Structure formats: C-alpha cells, structure tokens
Amino acid sequence: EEERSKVDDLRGTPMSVGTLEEIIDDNHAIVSTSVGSEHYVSILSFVDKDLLEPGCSVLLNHKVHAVIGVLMDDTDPLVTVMKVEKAPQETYADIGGLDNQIQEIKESVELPLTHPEYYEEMGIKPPKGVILYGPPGTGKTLLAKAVANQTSATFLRVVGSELIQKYLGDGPKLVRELFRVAEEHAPSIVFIDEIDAIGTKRYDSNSGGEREIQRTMLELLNQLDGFDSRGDVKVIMATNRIETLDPALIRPGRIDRKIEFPLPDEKTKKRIFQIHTSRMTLADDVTLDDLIMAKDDLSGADIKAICTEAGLMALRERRMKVTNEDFKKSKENVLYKKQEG
Amino acid sequence: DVLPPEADSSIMMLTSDQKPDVMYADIGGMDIQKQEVREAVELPLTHFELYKQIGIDPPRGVLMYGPPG
Amino acid sequence: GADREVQRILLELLNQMDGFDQNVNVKVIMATNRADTLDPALLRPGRLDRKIEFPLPDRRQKRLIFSTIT
Amino acid sequence: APPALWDLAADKQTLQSEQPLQVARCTKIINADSEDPKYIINVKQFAKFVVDLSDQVAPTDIEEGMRVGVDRNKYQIHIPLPPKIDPTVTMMQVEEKPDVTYSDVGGCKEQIEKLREVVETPLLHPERFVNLGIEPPKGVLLFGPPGTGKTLCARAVANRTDACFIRVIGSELVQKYVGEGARMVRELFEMARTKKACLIFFDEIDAIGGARFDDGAGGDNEVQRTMLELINQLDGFDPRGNIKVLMATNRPDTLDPALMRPGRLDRKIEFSLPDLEGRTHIFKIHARSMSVERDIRFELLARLCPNSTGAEIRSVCTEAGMFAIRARRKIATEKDFLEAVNKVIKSYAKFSATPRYMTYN
Amino acid sequence: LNAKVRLLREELQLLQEQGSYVGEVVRAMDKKKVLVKVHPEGKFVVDVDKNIDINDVTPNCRVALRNDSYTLHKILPNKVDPLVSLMMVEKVPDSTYEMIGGLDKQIKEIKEVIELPVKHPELFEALGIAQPKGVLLYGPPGTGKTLLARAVAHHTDCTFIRVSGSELVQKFIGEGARMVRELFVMAREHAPSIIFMDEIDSIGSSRLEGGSGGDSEVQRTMLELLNQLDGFEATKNIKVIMATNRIDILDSALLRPGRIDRKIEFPPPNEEARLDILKIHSRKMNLTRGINLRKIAELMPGASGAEVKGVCTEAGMYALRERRVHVTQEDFEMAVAKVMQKD
Numbered sequence A: 001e002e003e004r005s006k007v008d009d010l011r012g013t014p015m016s017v018g019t020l021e022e023i024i025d026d027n028h029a030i031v032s033t034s035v036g037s038e039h040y041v042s043i044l045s046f047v048d049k050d051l052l053e054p055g056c057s058v059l060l061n062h063k064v065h066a067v068i069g070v071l072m073d074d075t076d077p078l079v080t081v082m083k084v085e086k087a088p089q090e091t092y093a094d095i096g097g098l099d100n101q102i103q104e105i106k107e108s109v110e111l112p113l114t115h116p117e118y119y120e121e122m123g124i125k126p127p128k129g130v131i132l133y134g135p136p137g138t139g140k141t142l143l144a145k146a147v148a149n150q151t152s153a154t155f156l157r158v159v160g161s162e163l164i165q166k167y168l169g170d171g172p173k174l175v176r177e178l179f180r181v182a183e184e185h186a187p188s189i190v191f192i193d194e195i196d197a198i199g200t201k202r203y204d205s206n207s208g209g210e211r212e213i214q215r216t217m218l219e220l221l222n223q224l225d226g227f228d229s230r231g232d233v234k235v236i237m238a239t240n241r242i243e244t245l246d247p248a249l250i251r252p253g254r255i256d257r258k259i260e261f262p263l264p265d266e267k268t269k270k271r272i273f274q275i276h277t278s279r280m281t282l283a284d285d286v287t288l289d290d291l292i293m294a295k296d297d298l299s300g301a302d303i304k305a306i307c308t309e310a311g312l313m314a315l316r317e318r319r320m321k322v323t324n325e326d327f328k329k330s331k332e333n334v335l336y337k338k339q340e341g
Numbered sequence B: 001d002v003l004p005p006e007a008d009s010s011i012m013m014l015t016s017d018q019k020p021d022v023m024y025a026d027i028g029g030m031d032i033q034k035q036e037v038r039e040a041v042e043l044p045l046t047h048f049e050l051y052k053q054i055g056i057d058p059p060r061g062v063l064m065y066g067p068p069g
Numbered sequence C: 001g002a003d004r005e006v007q008r009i010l011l012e013l014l015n016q017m018d019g020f021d022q023n024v025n026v027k028v029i030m031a032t033n034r035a036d037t038l039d040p041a042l043l044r045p046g047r048l049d050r051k052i053e054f055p056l057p058d059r060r061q062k063r064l065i066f067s068t069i070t
Numbered sequence D: 001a002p003p004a005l006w007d008l009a010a011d012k013q014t015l016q017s018e019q020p021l022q023v024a025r026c027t028k029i030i031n032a033d034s035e036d037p038k039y040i041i042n043v044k045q046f047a048k049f050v051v052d053l054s055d056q057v058a059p060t061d062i063e064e065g066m067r068v069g070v071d072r073n074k075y076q077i078h079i080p081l082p083p084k085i086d087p088t089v090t091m092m093q094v095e096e097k098p099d100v101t102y103s104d105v106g107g108c109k110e111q112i113e114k115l116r117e118v119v120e121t122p123l124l125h126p127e128r129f130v131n132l133g134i135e136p137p138k139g140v141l142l143f144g145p146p147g148t149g150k151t152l153c154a155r156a157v158a159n160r161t162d163a164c165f166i167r168v169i170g171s172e173l174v175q176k177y178v179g180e181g182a183r184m185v186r187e188l189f190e191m192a193r194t195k196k197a198c199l200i201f202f203d204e205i206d207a208i209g210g211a212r213f214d215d216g217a218g219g220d221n222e223v224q225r226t227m228l229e230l231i232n233q234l235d236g237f238d239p240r241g242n243i244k245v246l247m248a249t250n251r252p253d254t255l256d257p258a259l260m261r262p263g264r265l266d267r268k269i270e271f272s273l274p275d276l277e278g279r280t281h282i283f284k285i286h287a288r289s290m291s292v293e294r295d296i297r298f299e300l301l302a303r304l305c306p307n308s309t310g311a312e313i314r315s316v317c318t319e320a321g322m323f324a325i326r327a328r329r330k331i332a333t334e335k336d337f338l339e340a341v342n343k344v345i346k347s348y349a350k351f352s353a354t355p356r357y358m359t360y361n
Numbered sequence E: 001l002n003a004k005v006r007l008l009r010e011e012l013q014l015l016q017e018q019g020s021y022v023g024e025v026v027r028a029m030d031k032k033k034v035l036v037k038v039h040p041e042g043k044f045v046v047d048v049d050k051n052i053d054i055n056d057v058t059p060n061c062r063v064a065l066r067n068d069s070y071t072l073h074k075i076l077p078n079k080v081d082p083l084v085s086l087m088m089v090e091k092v093p094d095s096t097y098e099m100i101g102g103l104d105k106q107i108k109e110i111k112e113v114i115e116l117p118v119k120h121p122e123l124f125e126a127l128g129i130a131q132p133k134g135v136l137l138y139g140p141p142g143t144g145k146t147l148l149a150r151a152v153a154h155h156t157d158c159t160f161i162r163v164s165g166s167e168l169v170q171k172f173i174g175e176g177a178r179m180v181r182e183l184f185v186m187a188r189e190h191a192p193s194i195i196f197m198d199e200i201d202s203i204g205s206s207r208l209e210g211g212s213g214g215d216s217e218v219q220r221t222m223l224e225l226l227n228q229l230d231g232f233e234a235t236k237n238i239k240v241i242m243a244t245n246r247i248d249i250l251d252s253a254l255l256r257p258g259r260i261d262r263k264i265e266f267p268p269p270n271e272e273a274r275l276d277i278l279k280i281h282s283r284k285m286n287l288t289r290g291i292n293l294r295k296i297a298e299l300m301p302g303a304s305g306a307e308v309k310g311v312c313t314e315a316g317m318y319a320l321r322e323r324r325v326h327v328t329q330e331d332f333e334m335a336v337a338k339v340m341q342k343d
C-alpha cells in the first residue's frame, strides 16, 4: 500500500548495481562498486541482511550508495552447462545383456531417492556414487546406462579432461563450482567419464603442469572425499582405462561400487542388432546369424553404424527397406573401415 | 562541425620531406624481393586501372620477414 | 585487456582495411622479427595477402654487398 | 508479508539516520602522520589528502596503514575501521559447526591420545602447562594411508569447544598469476593473530610443499615461494603462533617442509592402519547400524581381512545390508554377507587400491 | 521554420547539462525496472518509461538511455552474431558450387548427410535410421575442404561457424569455461548451424606430442560436443566438419571406435579437375582463347587446387608488367614454371 509508494521514492528512480564487499555489525556494510567505492550503509529494509553474504549483488541508491534491496541474478555459464535436459528417450530397457551388469548401479542410483524404505530402514546408506569402466572405446556405452538415470532425479554431465587443464589454473576452481552448484541444486547427479587428466599429454594453450593437473585431480578427490560435505550430488565416474587412475580416488569414493563392462556375447550381440533394426524395415533375406558370427567384439553403435550406412545406401537406391546384399557390402564399408585403419 | 578533415589528433603524416636517408642503390643483394616489393607497391600505385582491365585484384596487404640480416 | 581492446583495434583497422577497397587507396606494408606469434587472421587471405621473406645473403648477395659497402 | 511490512516501515527512522555518517565513502589508509593534528592519507579513489579526524575519535587511536572512515567533502577521518581484509577466500576457509565425535575413532588410541592432548589439554587447561612450563609444542603432523586421514580432523571439529579453527585445503593456495597465495597465507596468519588462540589445519600439503627444485626453467618457483614463504611466516619469532597448526597428508615427502617442521613443529605420528582386534571396533561402531543376528562373530571377520583400514570394512558393513536388501532379508547373517565381504575385499582388491604404503614407501 | 530554430534552443537546454546516455540492458526486472549496463560506467537498474514497454525490451539490447530519470528513451539495434560471422567472414568466402569442381562425387555424398536432416528428416524414421553427427575431410592439401564447408552451408542457408578461432572468440563468447557450451549456446540460438574445424590440420603439429593434446582437445572439443548432441540436448542440424590429413585420422578414429562419424574422403587434384576448375579461375581475367587448357593443366602433375589460383593470378602478373590488357598462353605457362620452381 503506502510503503510501496514510499520506499520507491528513496530508491528511485535510478539506483546503481553494487557488490557487497564485507559486513560490519553496525548494520553498516562495506560495499564495492566500480570503481574502488567503499561505504557504510545501515538499512533495515528488504533485508534478508543475514542471507546476503559478501560477493553478491546489492542495490545501491545514488544517494548515497544506499541499499534498498538485493537481486540475485544468474544465469552464469556453469548453470547453463547443466541442463537442458534431455529427459532422453533412451531407457535402460533399450539396451540388453547388461541386466546383471546394470541391476546393481540401477539400485545404487534408485536405492536412495526413489524407494527409500529398505534403504533408510536398513541403516546402511551407500550414496557415495559409482565408478564405471570398459573396453575398448565404450563408456558412452555406459551413457546408455546413465541415459536411463537422466530420466529421473536431477542431473549434470561433466566429462573429459579438456574442462580441467584447458588454460592456466585456478586448478580445480571449475571443479569447485561444479561441486558447490550441484550441492545448491541437491539432490542431483554428476556424471564423469573418460578421465584422461593423466592420459592427456599436451597442455592446452600455455599451461602447466603435470603435477598441477595431478594436484587439481587431488583436490577433486578432497572435494569428493570430503571435508566436510554431505551434499548429494551423487558422482558417477567412468573411463576406458582404469590403469592410469590413482588408488587415492577409490578408498574415499567410490569405495563400495564399481562395475566392469564386458563385451557382448552371441545372444547379446543378436539382441542389440534386433534393438537397432526394430525401427528399420529390412528385406526378407536379412540374417543376423552370419553377421554376429563374422563380426568380432562389436558393441551397440558399431552394428548400429552398419545399420546407418545400410540405410544410407538404401537411400542411394531410395528404398525404404534395406537389402541383405547391400547390408553385407554396406557392412563391408565398416568391416573394411576397421580393417583399413 | 567535425574534423575539417583531417586535422588529427596525433602521429602525424610526412616527416618525409626531411627524409629518407639514402637511395636504393645502397643494397644490391635482393633484386628479387625488391621486385615483389616493386610489383606489390608501385605498380599498383601508378595503375589502379590496368588491374581492372586485366581482371586481377591487387591486395594492399604486405608482410616482410626473415631477419636478420 | 586494454591491449585486448587494441587488438580489437587491430580488428577495427582490419575492417577499415577491407574498407579501403575498392580502389583508392592505401598500401599496408609490414615487417616483424618473429612472425610465429602473429595471429593468422591478419595473414589469412583477404587482408594481408603478401608474405615476403628476406633470405640470408648468398654468393650473388655476397659479392653485391661487398662491392656496395666497399 | 507482515515481517516485510514492519521491515519497510523502519525507513522513516532510517532516513533520519541516513543523513549522518553516510559520507563514510570511502575507506582509506593513511601513509604517514605529518604532525600531531595532521595525517597524510591515501584512498582507493587514488587521490591523497592530508587532514585531521572527526574529533569524537581520539587522535591516539590511529596507526600507519589504518583503514579509517571519512567525511568525503572535508576528507577528515570519520572513524577508524579495524578490518583491512579479506578477499572471500579466507572466510571461505573460516570454518564452523562440529560433526563426527570422538567415539567414531576406530580404536586408534596412542595416536588419538597424543594428537588429542597436544590440542585440547593446552587449550582446555592452559594454566596446567603454565604451572609446569616448559611449553607445549607448536604444531603436529598426520599422514599415512587414506584410511583414515582427515576424519580424525572431523573429530577435532566435534570435540572443539570454544575458539573456532580454520580449515585450509591444499589446492586453494596454488593459483595462477603468481603472488596471490602469498598474500593469502600471510593475511590468514594475520587473521589467526586477530582470532586469539584459534587454530589452523592443512590437508593435501604434499601438493604445495613439493621440494626442492629442478634444473630449469621452473617449475617449483611459484610452489617454492609459496611454501618457503609459509615457513618464512613460521620462522618469525612472533607469536608464534599461540594458534598451533595441524598437518595431515598422504606421503611424508617432501623433505624441505619436513626439515623445516621439526624445529617449530613436532609430534609427528603415523598410522596404523588396522590392528588385529582394532578392526572389531570398526565392526562395533558400524555394528550399531542395521541389525545384527546374535550369532555374528566379529573377530573371525576381522582376522580374515587384513590391511582394510576402516573404510573398506565400512563398505563391508555396507554390502551386508546391500545384499540383505537384494535378498529382502531384514537381517544379514555373518555367513550371508561374508560372501559379499570376500567378494568386496577379494574382487575389489584384485584390480587396484591398497598400495598406499607404496605411495609413501 | 521560425519555430524550429526556437526548438533547437529548448532542446539544447535539455541536452546541455547531461544530454542523454546510451544504455545496454543486461536483464529486465519484475517491478518494471530494467537492469542496464553502460560501457564506461557500472550497472544500473531503471524503470518505466511509459512510452517504452517491458515486452519490447529484452536482455542484451542497445537502448538509448535517458539522462534525467536514467531511463530508456529508445530501442536501438545491437550486434551479437556479427563478431561470429565477422571472425568467420574474414576466414572463408561464400564459394557456391560454381567455384568448385571435381568434388561432384563428394558433394553428392555429403548432400545426404547435410541435406537430409535439414529438409527430409521424417524419412530418417521412415527408414528407422539415426541422424549423422558430423563429417570429416581427409586429403593432401590441396584446397576445397574449406570451400565445400561454406558451399554446403551456403546453399543450405544454415548459419556457418568455424571452430576456434583464436583469441577473441573467447572474448565475445563467454568468459572462461569449457566454452563449447557457450559456443553451443550460440549454435542453439541460431539453428540450423554448421560447425567447421578451423583448421588444426598441419605438419606443425606433426610431432605426435604437442599436436597430440593441443589438437586432441579440439578433437575433444568435438568429442564432448558429440556427447552433448548424441547423449542429450536438442535437437538436430547442428553439425561438425573436419579437415585433417593423416595421423589424427588414425588417432581420431582411434578415439572413434567405429563410432561415431561419417567418413568422406578429400581427393588429390586430377588433370580434368585442373582443366575445368582452371577455367573456373581463368574466367575472371581478360585473356585470349589461344591457350590449350589440356597441356597447360597437364603441365601441373600433382600440385594442388590453389595451384590453379597461383598459376592464373601470377600469370596475370607478367600480363600487367607486360602492359598487355589481355594475356596469352605463353604467360600462363611462364606461371606454370613459377609455381613449379618451389617443387
């Protein structure tokens, strides 16, 4: 009522956007705005003065640097790197053969949160995350796992060494922003994959050094270890190579859970070929047997890629239905493709 | 109003009425790099027309390197 | 970052170096002692199109330089 | 809305108080004191002024480099303001609230006894040592395999009684644009000298204390100036520090901070690591969870798993209830979960982990 | 007319003490106030402005900033992409399919990969088949691997982007981060979009150590970009294009375990390519028809595509120094000698 027509005059019409530097118990807070402007502002209005905290945006009325209120504004790039979304279409039911492989990690992600009764009544509580690995170039094959975990709860994917040692650090502080922001959105899940921080060699741009990459991995550990953050943000880790990964990681976390990715067997290979050819119409003479027998240790996206080129040449003939002959020669483009490289 | 123009500010132009030092007869080494400088500097400077005639566009960008000497 | 604004100035006068065209006129000549760190945007075709390299003096350049200095 | 109603209705008295003391822009440190009344001053406005103070301030309260309030028009000193610091990094390190009390220790006693009496006893009962003085040591050191590092620190947090203590992680020291972590460590020492008997803890010191050097070009030079600078702050005679310190890491190397500690610091203690019967204590604190069939024999399980610290066997007590849930059984017999025990220590010891001795040996 | 000279007096008086500012809206607020950032100054927040409307004011827009109330007088056009398409507009010309020759097999084999998800895509699911994530071009340079990028994106009309990019795309786009999510934010704003890898194809960079990670984080750029596209985000049409030679063909396909990319070769020059594309470059210079293009293209065994440019232009050089307005065969053959001197 009258207060809205009052405080606006004092804070109106213009007011500077300021930054809270530090707080003095007088209700006077040392503030900062461009450039080098410190001051004492004692106001009882809009505050919330407890939750302000230094390093945040406080309004500044031109007469004189007075704070009528506070506006928390983000945005921020790292909040944009979290979502959206996908709520992806890929269930863990769209992949096969890993039912025993998955069923545990599926529990450990849905054992808390959804269906807590057994978990909380049991007084056990292992919500420290998981760890994955698998050859030869899989792991996003386990993003066919995490792609089902993307269908529930809250999630952010941060993967690859590039986002760590890119420029001169500042070390983990990007990892710090990830951990703390995933704690702000808690509950959540952070999926790490293919940790090459030791596996990569060249420093991007001008950067150093190997040990500072090792110490930023170290602080990744301590912030995951950790002293002292109960926030979850669960952590899912994966890679191709478990060799270069240091054991300093495993005892803090993930100590309880890590899965091995096997290569598919005959019925799993056949199963996956059925999964990818479920959509595609194929000629009556298409046979999966000679396929899964002739090929050796291929995962899903390999035979999925031979489906993709089979449909490619099927479009070169403008046929909605792929022929087995063009499936064997179009296949031979990937067969020879791995035999050429 | 605006600058006349051009009344600057700074630099300025010229200083070349009291300069340069000595003529190109000094150095006789290049004879080729000086010909690329020739065709890339004072052949376009005298003729903007012959380029449009022959239909080749002369660039203004020139970059030299190799030192020392 | 003020100097980042002066390489933004290099891009400014770069756009202006596209503005001299067509025809009349300017001649932008340039040299450097190390051309490694030069960002290619300049040298890349369309703006600075001429790469000149001073060679180390050879037998021709030797005798000619000896005669002209002597 | 009612609290915001009364919140916005205090601006009528606030605007009357807004007229006076508002001129406090900006904070400013002096440089020299010319005479008795006059002080030359520098302000981050970057203009510099020689002026007196607001006469309600006693002229003997000002020191060189003292941030002081101002009346901007007269430029006179308004009020001396204590804080000259700090960038949010140190208050980010400033720690509060306890957790993980004493009994959470896994049976380590001599360790916990020494690292306890070295902090509590001098801090809890200072008069005792002053009587027997002598002196209690400056600081301590912890290290060994990960299990269990940094957790006994959490215990120091719990049993911590009055004066707060500041946790310091290892990586926040090292930053690019060299000379930042130096100002950092220095100003946090000045803070601790303001905080009267407050304590500091350092984890991951092995990242910042890498010794000694390489050929060149460095290399350690930023690392060196930060750590050697830390020891430099440690080697000044004052206090130093009445604030103790605490050091926990993995590997005891490197030697330069380890040859700089024994003079100032002391009380280096090593882990230990599970005892034979020591593991049954972790099985006891972790046995309070879930439900124990009265037949369950701990010592069997404890002697069957050497070198597990307390974390691996905590994951044992974990996989117990895990496979107990997968079997829908509310209680887990010792024979029920011991399959997941030899499976977790066997299968999880197959690929990697437990070369932590080897990491520091 | 007598009233206009008086109007200048009063208007002068309102613009005399403060004139009027130029503002930039960073964000709009719920109380009808609008967060405004001035270049020389700090950020403000200011209100209606009854002539201006909140729905007419979106963040990141140049707005004439009233001097008195510190409000917004007008809405003015800003420029966001022109630095994107500027840094890219200096890199590469438009180069339609008339500027290219000999690639008919390869533009025909890329037209499905690029042109299917732009116009047809419902026939992806009519065939039940996945969409191509990107494409690569491997071959001895050579030219045309860069032209074909903005040729396919030029005729597809989807906005064309080349990857880093220095230095100053880290300026305009974002502040500091993985930064491919901010570049990917631009690619989300403007869709469909083409991302080209510019260039990091070099013998520089042939050591298999510096170029290993120095490139392999642009290879990792496109990699985690393929994690973005593949695993999540939305929707299609944002695609990546490669230019490499060897090694990182074997190192990328070592990081591409049959998954995922579309393989398209980039050919070495052919003699008949040199014929017709030699005519393509020779159309722009006053000349005589007395030249035999068969023997003048057969005088270039191996060489490259830009070899045609150097032959035709650097022949035009002896034509301009010769003072001839139109050239002859002998001069184009003299330029064949010129470009074969370095060989």
Ligand SMILES: Nc1ncnc2c1ncn2[C@@H]1O[C@H](COP(=O)(O)OP(=O)(O)OP(=O)(O)O)[C@@H](O)[C@H]1O
Pocket: A225, A226, A251, A252, D104, D105, D106, D107, D108, D144, D145, D146, D147, D148, D149, D150, D151, D203, D249, D250, D282, D309, D310, D311, D312, D314
């Ligand atoms: N002896 C023990 N007593 C009680 N709890 C233990 C013991 N050993 C391990 N734990 C439990 O195992 C977990 C992992 O240990 P912790 O992570 O604290 O060591 P750490 O932080 O890895 O050591 P470092 O800091 O050297 O890496 C802790 O949460 C702790 O509760």
Ligand SMILES: Nc1ncnc2c1ncn2[C@@H]1O[C@H](COP(=O)(O)OP(=O)(O)O)[C@@H](O)[C@H]1O
Pocket: A094, A095, A096, A137, A138, A139, A140, A141, A142, A143, A144, A193, A194, A264, A272, A299, A300, A301, A302, E230, E259, E260
């Ligand atoms: N066995 C499988 N069953 C079903 N889908 C699979 C299988 N293997 C791989 N895929 C699909 O192929 C992709 C494989 O990713 P991949 O490139 O192998 O891992 P990374 O990218 O981590 O090296 C996954 O996104 C998944 O959707």
Ligand SMILES: Nc1ncnc2c1ncn2[C@@H]1O[C@H](COP(=O)(O)OP(=O)(O)O)[C@@H](O)[C@H]1O
Pocket: E100, E101, E102, E141, E142, E143, E144, E145, E146, E147, E148, E243, E273, E277, E278, E304, E305, E306, E307, E308, E309
């Ligand atoms: N097939 C071709 N034959 C002859 N010249 C070509 C061909 N393709 C491109 N060029 C010439 O090369 C120039 C630039 O080539 P570009 O695509 O940038 O190659 P690169 O990627 O090797 O730099 C163009 O101006 C064009 O005239």
